[PDB]
Amino acid sequence: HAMALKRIQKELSDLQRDPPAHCSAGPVGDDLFHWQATIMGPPDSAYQGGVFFLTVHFPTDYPFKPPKIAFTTKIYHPNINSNGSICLDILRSQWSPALTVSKVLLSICSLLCDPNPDDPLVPDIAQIYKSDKEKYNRHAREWTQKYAM
Amino acid sequence: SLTVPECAICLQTCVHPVSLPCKHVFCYLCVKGASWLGKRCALCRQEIPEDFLDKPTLLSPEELKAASRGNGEYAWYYEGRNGWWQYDERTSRELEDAFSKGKKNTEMLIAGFLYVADLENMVQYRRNEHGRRRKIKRDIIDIPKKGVAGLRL
Numbered sequence: 647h648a649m650a651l652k653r654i655q656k657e658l659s660d661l662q663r664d665p666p667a668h669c670s671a672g673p674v675g676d677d678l679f680h681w682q683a684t685i686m687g688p689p690d691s692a693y694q695g696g697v698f699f700l701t702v703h704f705p706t707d708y709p710f711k712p713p714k715i716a717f718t719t720k721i722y723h724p725n726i727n728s729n730g731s732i733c734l735d736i737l738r739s740q741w742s743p744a745l746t747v748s749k750v751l752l753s754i755c756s757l758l759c760d761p762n763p764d765d766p767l768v769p770d771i772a773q774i775y776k777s778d779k780e781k782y783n784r785h786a787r788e789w790t791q792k793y794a795m
Numbered sequence: 796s797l798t799v800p801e802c803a804i805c806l807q808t809c810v811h812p813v814s815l816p817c818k819h820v821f822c823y824l825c826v827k828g829a830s831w832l833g834k835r836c837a838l839c840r841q842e843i844p845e846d847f848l849d850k851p852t853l854l855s856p857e858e859l860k861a862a863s864r865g866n867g868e869y870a871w872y873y874e875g876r877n878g879w880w881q882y883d884e885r886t887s888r889e890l891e892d893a894f895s896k897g898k899k900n901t902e903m904l905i906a907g908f909l910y911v912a913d914l915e916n917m918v919q920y921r922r923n924e925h926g927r928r929r930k931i932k933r934d935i936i937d938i939p940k941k942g943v944a945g946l947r948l
């Protein structure tokens with residue numbers, strides 16, 4: 647699967663050279679198809695000061711399909727559930743080979759700052775986001791302290 | 796754009812950029828490599844014509860003619876049926892680098908597979924299967940040739 651491998655190697659080199667703000671990523675040992683990533687909760691987000699660990703797995707026909715990216719750290723968020731699944735259009739049908747893991751990571755950081763309650767992976771949380779934002783922020787900060795600090 | 800477009804498959808500047816009917820542009824060899832997997836346009840999923848690899852629409856045909864006379868003094872070639880094909884300019888730079896440093900060999904990604912260029916014996920072959928073999932040489936630009944990287948001239 648040499649097309650994928652070389653594409654992934656190129657992304658890695660570019661990422662580690664100019665890493666996206668708030669983010670770190672790298673392969674698991676010598677295996678370029680499995681990466682780990684880390685997001686430090688953006689300043690001014692309700693997740694600030696939180697350390698979030700993610701997994702990235704590349705498909706054998708990358709970049710024609712998106713990487714599979716999941717949270718391993720518990721987080722209170724309408725677009726991210728208890729399995730760590732991330733509800734984001736560019737990880738589904740809006741994937742494009744013009745995108746990179748670096749860009750996906752920044753989009754995930756952007757989702758932490760501004761959740762999308764109209765794509766409600768966790769309905770109960772999405773409803774609170776829409777009806778009581780102060781309560782939402784309180785809960786998101788509480789979970790950041792509990793599970794991500 | 797004054798600059799050569801970037802290829803969304805390999806993320807590099809396009810080499811021998813070809814234009815699909817949907818008007819997306821990719822390296823010719825990235826399109827060829829993706830054809831082994833039966834892919835449509837990587838960007839919009841629209842069909843790639845059945846005969847596209849044999850009759851591609853080049854983004855700049857004039858620039859192919861220039862490539863086949865462009866690197867001044869020397870070029871790299873691989874064996875075809877009854878003639879030589881010139882290597883694409885990006886692989887040629889890798890070969891030249893390795894050769895100039897005295898490397899015994901180097902690896903190259905070519906249309907979806909890894910090839911070894913064996914610079915001691917001047918042969919290239921698919922790394923997975925050593926039977927797919929083509930002689931290579933480093934000669935002047937002004938020789939007769941079949942084309943560049945599978946593109947006819």
Ligand SMILES: Nc1ncnc2c1ncn2[C@@H]1O[C@H](COP(=O)(O)O)[C@@H](O)[C@H]1O[C@H]1O[C@H](COP(=O)(O)O)[C@@H](O)[C@H]1O
Nearest residue numbers: 873874875876880882883905906921927928929941944945
């Ligand atoms: N260095 C290379 N540059 C571009 N394509 C290559 C190269 N090496 C292999 N391929 C392509 O990879 C495929 C398998 O080659 P194999 O079995 O050796 O690994 C072939 O399509 C190779 O393309 C060539 O052969 C084609 C026919 O030309 P005739 O033999 O009729 O002169 C022509 O497109 C030409 O460019």
Ligand SMILES: [Zn+2]
Nearest residue numbers: 802805822825
């Ligand atoms: Zn390309």
Ligand SMILES: [Zn+2]
Nearest residue numbers: 817819836839
């Ligand atoms: Zn297209």
